[PDB]
Amino acid sequence: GFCRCLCRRGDCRCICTR
């Protein structure tokens, strides 16, 4: 239920878990 975001080679997106 928590979202943490990442930038993978300039590709930013968020991933949610819990």
Side-chain angles (χ1 to χ4, degrees):
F2 176 77
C3 305
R4 53 183 296 182
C5 305
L6 66 164
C7 296
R8 176 274 308 245
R9 188 180 176 179
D11 174 77
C12 304
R13 60 185 61 238
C14 303
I15 183 178
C16 306
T17 178
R18 185 192 182 171

